[PDB]
Amino acid sequence: SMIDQAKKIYISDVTLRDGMHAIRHRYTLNHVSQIARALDEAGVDSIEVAHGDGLKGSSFNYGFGAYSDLEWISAAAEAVKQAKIATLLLPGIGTVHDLREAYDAGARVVRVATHCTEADVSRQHIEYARGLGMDTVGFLMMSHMQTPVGLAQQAKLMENYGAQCIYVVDSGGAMNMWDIAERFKALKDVLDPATQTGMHAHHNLSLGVANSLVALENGCDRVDASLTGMGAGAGNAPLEVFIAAAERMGLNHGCDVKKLINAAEDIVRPLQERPVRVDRETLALGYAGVYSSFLRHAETAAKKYNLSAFDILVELGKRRMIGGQEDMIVDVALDMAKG
Amino acid sequence: GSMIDQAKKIYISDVTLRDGMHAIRHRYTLNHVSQIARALDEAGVDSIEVAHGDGLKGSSFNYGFGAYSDLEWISAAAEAVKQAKIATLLLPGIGTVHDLREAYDAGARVVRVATHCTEADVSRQHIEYARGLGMDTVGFLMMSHMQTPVGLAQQAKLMENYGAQCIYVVDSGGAMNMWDIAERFKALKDVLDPATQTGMHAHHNLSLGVANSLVALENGCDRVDASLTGMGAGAGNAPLEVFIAAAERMGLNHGCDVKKLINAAEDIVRPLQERPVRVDRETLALGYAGVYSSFLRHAETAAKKYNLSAFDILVELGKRRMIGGQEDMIVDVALDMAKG
Amino acid sequence: NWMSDDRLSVAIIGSGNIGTDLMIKIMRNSKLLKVGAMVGIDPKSDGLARAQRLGVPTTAEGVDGLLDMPAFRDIKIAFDATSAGAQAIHNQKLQAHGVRVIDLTPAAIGPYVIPVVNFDQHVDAPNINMVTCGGQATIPIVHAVSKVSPVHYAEIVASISSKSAGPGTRANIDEFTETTSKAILEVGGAAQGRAIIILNPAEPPLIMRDTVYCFVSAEANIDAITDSVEQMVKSVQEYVPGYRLKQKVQFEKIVAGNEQNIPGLGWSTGLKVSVFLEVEGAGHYLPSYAGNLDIMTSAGLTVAERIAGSG
Amino acid sequence: LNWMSDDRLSVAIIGSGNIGTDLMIKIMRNSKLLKVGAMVGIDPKSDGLARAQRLGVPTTAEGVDGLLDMPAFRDIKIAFDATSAGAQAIHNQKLQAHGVRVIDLTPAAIGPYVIPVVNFDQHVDAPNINMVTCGGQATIPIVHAVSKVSPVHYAEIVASISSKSAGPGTRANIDEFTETTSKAILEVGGAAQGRAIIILNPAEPPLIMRDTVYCFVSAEANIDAITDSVEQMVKSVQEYVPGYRLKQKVQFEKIVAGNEQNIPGLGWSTGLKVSVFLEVEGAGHYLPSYAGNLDIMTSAGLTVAERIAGSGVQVGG
Ligand SMILES: O=C([O-])C(=O)[O-]
Ligand SMILES: O=C([O-])C(=O)[O-]
Ligand SMILES: [Zn+2]
Numbered sequence A: 001s002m003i004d005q006a007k008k009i010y011i012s013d014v015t016l017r018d019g020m021h022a023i024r025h026r027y028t029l030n031h032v033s034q035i036a037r038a039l040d041e042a043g044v045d046s047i048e049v050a051h052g053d054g055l056k057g058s059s060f061n062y063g064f065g066a067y068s069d070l071e072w073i074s075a076a077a078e079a080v081k082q083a084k085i086a087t088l089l090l091p092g093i094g095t096v097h098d099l100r101e102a103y104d105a106g107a108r109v110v111r112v113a114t115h116c117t118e119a120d121v122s123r124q125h126i127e128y129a130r131g132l133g134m135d136t137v138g139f140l141m142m143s144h145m146q147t148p149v150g151l152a153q154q155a156k157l158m159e160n161y162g163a164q165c166i167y168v169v170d171s172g173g174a175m176n177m178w179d180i181a182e183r184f185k186a187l188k189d190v191l192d193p194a195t196q197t198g199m200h201a202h203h204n205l206s207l208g209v210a211n212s213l214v215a216l217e218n219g220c221d222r223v224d225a226s227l228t229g230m231g232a233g234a235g236n237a238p239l240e241v242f243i244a245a246a247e248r249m250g251l252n253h254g255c256d257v258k259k260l261i262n263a264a265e266d267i268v269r270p271l272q273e274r275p276v277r278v279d280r281e282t283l284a285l286g287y288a289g290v291y292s293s294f295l296r297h298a299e300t301a302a303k304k305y306n307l308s309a310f311d312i313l314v315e316l317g318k319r320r321m322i323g324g325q326e327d328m329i330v331d332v333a334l335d336m337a338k339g
Numbered sequence B: 001g002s003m004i005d006q007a008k009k010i011y012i013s014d015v016t017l018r019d020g021m022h023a024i025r026h027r028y029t030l031n032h033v034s035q036i037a038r039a040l041d042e043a044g045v046d047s048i049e050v051a052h053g054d055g056l057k058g059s060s061f062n063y064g065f066g067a068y069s070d071l072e073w074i075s076a077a078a079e080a081v082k083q084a085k086i087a088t089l090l091l092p093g094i095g096t097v098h099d100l101r102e103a104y105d106a107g108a109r110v111v112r113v114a115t116h117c118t119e120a121d122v123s124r125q126h127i128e129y130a131r132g133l134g135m136d137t138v139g140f141l142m143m144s145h146m147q148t149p150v151g152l153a154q155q156a157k158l159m160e161n162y163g164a165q166c167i168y169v170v171d172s173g174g175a176m177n178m179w180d181i182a183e184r185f186k187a188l189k190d191v192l193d194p195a196t197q198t199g200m201h202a203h204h205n206l207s208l209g210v211a212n213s214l215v216a217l218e219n220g221c222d223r224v225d226a227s228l229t230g231m232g233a234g235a236g237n238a239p240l241e242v243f244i245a246a247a248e249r250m251g252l253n254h255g256c257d258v259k260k261l262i263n264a265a266e267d268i269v270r271p272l273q274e275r276p277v278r279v280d281r282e283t284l285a286l287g288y289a290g291v292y293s294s295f296l297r298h299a300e301t302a303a304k305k306y307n308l309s310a311f312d313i314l315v316e317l318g319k320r321r322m323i324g325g326q327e328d329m330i331v332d333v334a335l336d337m338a339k340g
Numbered sequence C: 001n002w003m004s005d006d007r008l009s010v011a012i013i014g015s016g017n018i019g020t021d022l023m024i025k026i027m028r029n030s031k032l033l034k035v036g037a038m039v040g041i042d043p044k045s046d047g048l049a050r051a052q053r054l055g056v057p058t059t060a061e062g063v064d065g066l067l068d069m070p071a072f073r074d075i076k077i078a079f080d081a082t083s084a085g086a087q088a089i090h091n092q093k094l095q096a097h098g099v100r101v102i103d104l105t106p107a108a109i110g111p112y113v114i115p116v117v118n119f120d121q122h123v124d125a126p127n128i129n130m131v132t133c134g135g136q137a138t139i140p141i142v143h144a145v146s147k148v149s150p151v152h153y154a155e156i157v158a159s160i161s162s163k164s165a166g167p168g169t170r171a172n173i174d175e176f177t178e179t180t181s182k183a184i185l186e187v188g189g190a191a192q193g194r195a196i197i198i199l200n201p202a203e204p205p206l207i208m209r210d211t212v213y214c215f216v217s218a219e220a221n222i223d224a225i226t227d228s229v230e231q232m233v234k235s236v237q238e239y240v241p242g243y244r245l246k247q248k249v250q251f252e253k254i255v256a257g258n259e260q261n262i263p264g265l266g267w268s269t270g271l272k273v274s275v276f277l278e279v280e281g282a283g284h285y286l287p288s289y290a291g292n293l294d295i296m297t298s299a300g301l302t303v304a305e306r307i308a309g310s311g
Numbered sequence D: 001l002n003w004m005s006d007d008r009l010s011v012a013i014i015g016s017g018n019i020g021t022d023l024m025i026k027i028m029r030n031s032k033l034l035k036v037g038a039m040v041g042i043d044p045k046s047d048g049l050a051r052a053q054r055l056g057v058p059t060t061a062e063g064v065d066g067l068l069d070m071p072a073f074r075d076i077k078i079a080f081d082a083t084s085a086g087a088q089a090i091h092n093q094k095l096q097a098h099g100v101r102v103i104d105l106t107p108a109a110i111g112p113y114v115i116p117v118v119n120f121d122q123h124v125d126a127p128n129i130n131m132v133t134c135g136g137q138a139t140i141p142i143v144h145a146v147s148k149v150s151p152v153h154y155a156e157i158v159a160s161i162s163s164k165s166a167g168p169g170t171r172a173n174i175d176e177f178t179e180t181t182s183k184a185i186l187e188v189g190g191a192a193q194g195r196a197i198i199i200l201n202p203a204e205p206p207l208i209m210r211d212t213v214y215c216f217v218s219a220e221a222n223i224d225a226i227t228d229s230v231e232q233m234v235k236s237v238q239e240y241v242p243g244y245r246l247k248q249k250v251q252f253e254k255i256v257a258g259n260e261q262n263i264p265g266l267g268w269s270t271g272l273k274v275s276v277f278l279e280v281e282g283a284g285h286y287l288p289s290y291a292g293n294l295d296i297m298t299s300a301g302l303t304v305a306e307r308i309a310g311s312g313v314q315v316g317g
């Protein structure tokens, strides 16, 4: 493995953002304080907090949040002493006004996430986040849908706008290690060498730890993961497992392995309702390249309309639906119930 | 993307009814065997492995007694399949040539003779006897993380010498990442006769079961061990239906029915799971500390009994460098820790 | 006895997608309007070439070049298909000349008008703003439901094909969700409002989709809502032929035991109304998948015509 | 009790490798009743023969034919065979023809299995005695100690031996270890059903041999009496194996209805599982600490010869 064991891996947790999807956005303020504290004391560089679909994800479409982002980010910002509080913003869902609210509640990292062909809608957010003095990251959602060279040019756009780090985002958990490597190659080809890269894997093919380590091997600087993988679909790269695997490779992750193992089992896993695991329905997200936040809504539809969520998800993949199109989960369910 | 030959047939060996015995304390009924073997067989798998968790005559105080004998289990599978080969597993020191004869009479045509990855030389009689029966004879080198690529290949060569037609890299501890897997297949391919096949038996303890089986294929592997839901020791084997679904996205010649494997996993097998076959603190320990995966539920039983962390028992078992078949040492470690 | 040519001469400002589609649409469908002039900033613009082909005076000297045109003395309405910062400039110049202004930018100088909802209230408005694509397609449904029972919360999801997404929307995508929410309140009648927009590059390009979520008290008459909504649909296809329900109107009892955190209200119970729209483009000059742009030209056109027939 | 009084039985050691040589050294260091009259080997270069001629023991590199011609053979009354099973068949034929008793440390199993603390007396006159396996010598004492207090329906032993120290013959015939040991667990240990498992572990810092003994007995067995039988057995083995000890207290586990175990021989069963965890360290004087598997063989063979010698006259007919 040509990974530089000395290079520090930026560890970016998403238990309290992506994990919102696993708990229908119903984290309490005490959940957020307790989990941000454990992750803070375990050495992670950033804790990400927002509704799963990002700033102002709370909605009929994605689910209403149990508290606002403001209350959530304030709880996290107050609980952590060394980690930065990150947040997620999807243009078309959240706005720069929402960002300004998040920065004022304590977030100092923002990831502006567009679909991977639509980076040019993110300029005003990337610029405004730079103006605030934030660490400004671009997120290219659903990266499996885009060629490496195509994905890299979109990364270049967000870089032109002032983003200091672009993430390869496998929103559908659909990519394997070779897909991942090809895409980091393409990015390091065109990005300024100083611009950092990150990896946001989903575990839908059980490749969340594997893809993150391979991203590292092709130059990646930042790794998104979550405790028990708490996240959309089969979850994110499981943070305690990736850290345990990085330890055995001797990598400079700077985390307390046992602390993460213990926080994952003792704090987070007991909060799970629908089990964050690879199974028929979450496998379908990866097999068919469907946005992972669809999983619980698709199972909602599967029950309410008496159909197979698996088939519902395969049909959503067949219509090339992307992130934020939860309303088409019902469209597709309604169509299947007709015929 | 990769350098795998998308046209090369992947031999698919299911271990649901053997390594998966460990998930169910070897209490699979004859009816589980028949239903699961038939489902696996009708989905296109090449082999279905049937034996006690620890192989022929695994049944014991040491590993757990089995609800039925190997003979009845193997017979039940042999009878219920129409195309797949019935495989079985044999550990010298536990199972014997006489147990191999019995399993052959009961319908097994593949046998994997498993030794620690430094003790290939105890397998001659078994590998030689199996060749004389005209069985597909395979050599298993367990705890392959505890050996160096080159040493492992030297043990593999010994087993080829005795008559093995195939040799498997065995991550019994679920402790190896993709680079470890690759270095070992390269070393295997340097020394093995080109006609000797090669196989992967990953465990999922670091969630690399599927990734390690794919990277093995990029490096020349012919056979992949897996099981439905991962049903198996520890966090499980390579999850069969996941592996096939990833291989299918890659256009690999696996020859399996994705949806049938996916539905048998959910509808037949997972329901039979007692302790969840997943990556959590206790199964993670197996891969983190390099500990034989069958230890998992006995460790957790000692942990409940003497009021200890199962994690600590497993880590200490790694520190002492216990290997396959040494379940008696789990109690030994627990008794020592309780003296505190 | 047939018609008499009482047509109002109108000016179209902007030479791109919108202005050209509004041009073709008026010449092929209006008894009441004549395109008197088209206004660009570039004498190379094909839109300007088209207008000249179809016999329409042009200028490439902007609104300044328009007032100097001999056709301007009969112009009674002008449409602005440029930008909001340009409209702030244009409005004054045309107002001072008596020209009614129909603004297709989000400059929002004049009031928001969804024609089928609150045109009559703004018949005399000298400057009229057409809000957004989503507003023109969702507020009708919001107001349809709010007729039966007061809508405590309205939320719209605009799914638009990336090819048709106009450069204005791409450069200020927050303004889309902001303009639309504002008008969901004012014109739609909702206590709280929310607007979301999604660009999808699927090939073949997706027809526009608009999902409308309404939250009303558990009392609300389900059958009456269905009637108000379906009747409102037809009122809208009078100028947006492609505007059709994709799914029968859906209703979900939000029972006790499944309280939702509706914003503005607290944790609440009641009824959830979901209507699934689809807006195919008319095909006049823009493609069928550009329903976002076609609903704007259609709605601006019908506002101009209602002015014309008002007297 | 004069200075020159020599009443020791002269024994011959056939095999000059590890077993034979450790046995030679152990007799000279410890036995008061035996003397090493000859070491019989097959290769003039063997370090065992070098050591023997150094300690002044007559030697031959010409097998048992070489022994039969030695002046030392006249007084050899007991022969140890630590060579091969096939060779012992031939060796025994020659030796019996000269009326010499044979203690066989190979798997030839011509004569009865003997575990000295269990069934030596029953075989005091046996012209050929087999020493079973290292595992059997280690664990059958425990099986017998339990069986004395309560019938052992099922006994199972797990031998864990360092890779370095595992005998070439055990490596070549690992099945035979499990079969011979479980056979002798019945005949000599007294269990109704027998199981033996062997594991070879290559740990650096070579491992001291471990043996775990499992006995399944009825629910009403006397727990205190079993503990005392086992602890007393351990004291008896320690007379000839000093490094033989309990690593853990005797363990007991109730198997109660609702958790029946499919114990072979019985079917599903309730009762009591006795677990005895032994550690067996070798004397470490010629063979190292971790070679307990070899050291217990020579210890056991020495003590059988010593008890033969303590019966009475040696007559070679
Ligand atoms: O933004 C995310 O978390 C994603 O799209 O996977
Ligand atoms: O046999 C096995 O399954 C092993 O050793 O992992
Ligand atoms: Zn995600």
Ligand SMILES: [Zn+2]
Pocket: B019, B172, B201, B203, B233, B293
């Ligand atoms: Zn295994």
